[PDB]
Amino acid sequence: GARIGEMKRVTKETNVSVKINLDGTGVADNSSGIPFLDHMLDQLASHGLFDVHVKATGDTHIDDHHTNEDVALAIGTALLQALGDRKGINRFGNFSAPLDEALVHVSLDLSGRPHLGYDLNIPTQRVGKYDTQLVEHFFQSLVNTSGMTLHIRQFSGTNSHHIIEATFKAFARALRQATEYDTRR
Amino acid sequence: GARIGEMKRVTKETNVSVKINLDGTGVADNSSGIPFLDHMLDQLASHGLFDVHVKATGDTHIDDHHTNEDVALAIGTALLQALGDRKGINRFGNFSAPLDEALVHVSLDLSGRPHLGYDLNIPTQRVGKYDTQLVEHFFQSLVNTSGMTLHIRQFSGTNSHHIIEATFKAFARALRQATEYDTRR
Amino acid sequence: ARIGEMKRVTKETNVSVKINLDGTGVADNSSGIPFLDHMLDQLASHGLFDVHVKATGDTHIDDHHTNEDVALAIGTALLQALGDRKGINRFGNFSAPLDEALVHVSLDLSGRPHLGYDLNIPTQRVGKYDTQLVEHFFQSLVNTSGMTLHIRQFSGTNSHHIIEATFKAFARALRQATEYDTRR
Amino acid sequence: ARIGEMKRVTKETNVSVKINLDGTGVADNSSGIPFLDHMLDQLASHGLFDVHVKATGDTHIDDHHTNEDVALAIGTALLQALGDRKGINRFGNFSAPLDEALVHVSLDLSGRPHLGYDLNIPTQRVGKYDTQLVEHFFQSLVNTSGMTLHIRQFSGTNSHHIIEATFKAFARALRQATEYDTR
Amino acid sequence: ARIGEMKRVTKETNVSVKINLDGTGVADNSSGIPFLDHMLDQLASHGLFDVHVKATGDTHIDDHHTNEDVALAIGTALLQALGDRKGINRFGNFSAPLDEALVHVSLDLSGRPHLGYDLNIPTQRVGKYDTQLVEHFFQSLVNTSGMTLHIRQFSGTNSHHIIEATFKAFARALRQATEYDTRR
Amino acid sequence: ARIGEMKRVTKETNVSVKINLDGTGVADNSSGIPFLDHMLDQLASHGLFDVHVKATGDTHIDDHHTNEDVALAIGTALLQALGDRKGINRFGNFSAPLDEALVHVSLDLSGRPHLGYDLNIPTQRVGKYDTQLVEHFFQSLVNTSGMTLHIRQFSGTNSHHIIEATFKAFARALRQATEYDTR
Ligand SMILES: [Mn+2]
Ligand SMILES: [Mn+2]
Ligand SMILES: [Mn+2]
Ligand SMILES: [Mn+2]
Ligand SMILES: [Mn+2]
Ligand SMILES: [Mn+2]
Ligand SMILES: [Mn+2]
Ligand SMILES: [Mn+2]
Ligand SMILES: [Mn+2]
Ligand SMILES: [Mn+2]
Ligand SMILES: [Mn+2]
Ligand SMILES: [Mn+2]
């Protein structure tokens, strides 16, 4: 069957609905209220071959922080639900993704023990309207609810959009590897 | 009885109305024209158990500075009015508040002598649309009209929203302690 | 009374934990690691928790797996005992001196795990206990309890004093956080 | 009420101290050192102790011997008042601002004496009071009371403010440590 | 089979290239530069490409023009063989050891040319081959293939080892990128 | 199945090793060194090798000779199992995290021995296991297997985590290198 996780999370700050298919075809259906995060979630779908559905409304008139955090939390929980007992999967994923001058390596373990090692050097404070501090917070929150070990390391890069997008491409392809089944097991 | 302070302050730049209940239940009713400041004033209510009512219109088309300053000034005066003779209260308040990776300590004395010692290190210039320089100015203006001694010290923190929100949480809980009655007196 | 229980059996360890947040300081700790037992006793005596920990494990390899699985189980029991966390102080703060050592702990039963760890332990072993396991104990406890936890050493030169002051401060900060806020 | 009393007569000093741990803030301090009297008053006012200190001594030499013997007697009086120390909070913590100064005090009525002292007092005299005597006051008090005491300055430029904030923080930390743990 | 061919004749050089992306490792390289031939052989043996390169040029001046025009022609042949690039892995990564040398290559058949080049080659000549030509080879190949290419040396002291490890890693990363993604 | 077996008896040690390159993760490790047994188990679990190690030795001196002779025998057993090394991937690469630790392993079953070792293990003992023996284990394994082996730590503060991540990465890199290149 297909491993699908779903989470609806409604707080005073945000209203979030997430659906992810680990065995998808790359369907991207993201409307988080944060356009740049939508663009990154689209890359998660296209490069991981996940089906990624995210719909959120939130207090973005304050800033994007609460929406960003609650979407990441919901995605992490949906990933955890889809993974189930995690029997027979590769479990580990590794990928170095270039995007022009940027190069970011991601290494991860669907271990059940949350840890984020974050070593990006994003040189500007905003990409579009998106606060670049929210990139670290997105992956921290996703790690916290999914229970994964996640290491993100920038080897090259000067354009903030390129650095962040390379991160999502590498994360997407590393996560695809980790979630795929180990045929020898 | 309940200690309630009220101040309406109308200038060429701003029109401000403030009502604070030191003996409240955490009612938050904040519409300052500055959404991030509203969010921080909500935390003042929820974490201090103050009832906090703030309504302001102002020249936010110039920037948020005048509104931020006049709201803080009015709040400080309302706090001073609510405190009265300050007989029998704890007078001093201390609290260290974490918010994820951030940790901010606040120490204060309802002394009648204004002083702000401000030692935050906010790494970005805007949270949402809110100019992070306005955090220091908010507490300076509040100190000036309330007459309190206020020390704010950041021990940890990398996310600007977390640092500022931890500051308001610690301030709220320190102020609650300082305003509560000393039963032994 | 808010009581949490967790029994966790792996190929490496067999762990049973019961904690009473509204206890009287009953300490009943046999983790297989004597120094950790001594620290868990302080949790009970200084936090006024009832703490029951029983574990066997592959300590012939090292104390790592037992230390980790005990901490994981305690965090889950703490989360279970806390329930909806309604009406509690939620935050706790305490600076504990122990002779020349002074350690501050600040914590929030927020549901969001984070460990900020700033101890400077000068030796590698207290008794047989590997001092690297102190950080791993609190990291694992944070991961299953959902706590925000900051530990900062302001003074200290004896490793036993530094670690014990940490547990005393943690115990008293956790007691404060779990107690009820009368106004709420 | 938990009252401690100590009369200490040396060739240098004649000191009488009485402290009520369960007092109301009664301050009656005449040590022969006016600034120390002001500080002991803050101990009563902010700790809600009743503090009676009367001393004569060889202040024509300097204030050192009087300062030392007063602190020794206070520490003994405090220990006597504490008794078996059963049921008390035992630990005390407080950060006290005084304008630009901010001093944290953490203590444990442990029975094991230790002073950790980290003030940065920028002048040598407040009035006629030698600022070296602040450290010696707390060291001697720790020696006879047997308490663990940590004093840390986080802010401060005025010597009077720094020292007064220290006594305010010490008084409130000591009040917390001597009070009963209701649970 | 995806086969690319390019014949490029200038006043300086006469170059003919044919590459089979779905080959068996057939190596047929006579560029006029023996060390480059040795490197192009590794492209075939380690990438399982069929690589045919024949060039004559003004090597009596130096190897520069031949090196550049060979690399330009290979990049064009690679682009021609790739076609619409539909359904392929697109990205390739490989770290190749060669004794003490270790070189990582990461590439994307993105269509956007970029060379990130971080080798530290300690000598100026391997045989008769000027080691400045290594960077120019990959820069020229990137320019005509439309590839994003990052080359990073993690270890290495022998220039022949460093350069050969680079071509082995490039060959295996390129093989991965050109192979088909079964799920797509 | 590709099985290698080596029995090595010195005046210091008596070692028997059997490895199945095409195994299912069967772990049967009794080297006399409990932490090394734990690491060899990870080799089986994460590499899907069948790993049988039985050794007795002069561990009353220290673990060095046992550690060394076990690694030598494993390297020989691996080489014997590889045979002509025809049709295999030959190269292996893997980055393995373990909580805060992250270790990359790159190797080539080249026949030319080399160890490039860049770990930063912050303590001298994990349990009773001397952490100097990690480098010596891989150096000896390289010497008898003839492999090119590069080990690089990118992150890590806990010695147990760093060493375990190294074995996980080595096991998965070795699995990749021994598997058949289908094309
Ligand atoms: Mn947040
Ligand atoms: Mn883009
Ligand atoms: Mn202004
Ligand atoms: Mn917020
Ligand atoms: Mn561990
Ligand atoms: Mn002890
Ligand atoms: Mn003296
Ligand atoms: Mn004064
Ligand atoms: Mn040129
Ligand atoms: Mn060669
Ligand atoms: Mn040796
Ligand atoms: Mn282990």
Residue numbers in the entry:
A (entry chain A), B (entry chain A): 77 to 261
C (entry chain D), E (entry chain D): 78 to 261
D (entry chain C), F (entry chain C): 78 to 260
Which of the paper's sentences describe this entry?
Plant HISN5 catalyzes the sixth step of the HBP, in which imidazole-glycerol phosphate (IGP) is dehydrated to form imidazole-acetol phosphate (IAP). The MtHISN5 subunit contains a four α-helix bundle sandwiched between two β-sheets whose four strands are almost perpendicular to each other. In solution, MtHISN5 forms a homo 24-mer with octahedral (432) symmetry of approx. 110 Å diameter and a total mass of 540 kDa. The dimensions of the MtHISN5 oligomer did not change significantly after the binding of IG2, indicating a lack of major conformational rearrangements. The active site of MtHISN5 (see below) contains two Mn2+ cations (Mn1 and Mn2) bound by residues belonging to different subunits.
We also obtained the structure in space group I4 at 1.69 Å resolution with six chains in the ASU. The crystal structures cover the MtHISN5 sequence starting from Gly77 or Ala78 through Arg260/261 (chain and structure-dependent). The structure at 1.69 contains FMT, GOL, and TRS. The crystal structures were obtained in the presence of formate (FMT) between Mn1 and Mn2, which completes their coordination spheres. FMTs primary location was in the active sites, between Mn1 and Mn2. Consistently, we identified TRS (121 Da) and CIT (192 Da) in the 3- and 4-fold tunnels, respectively.
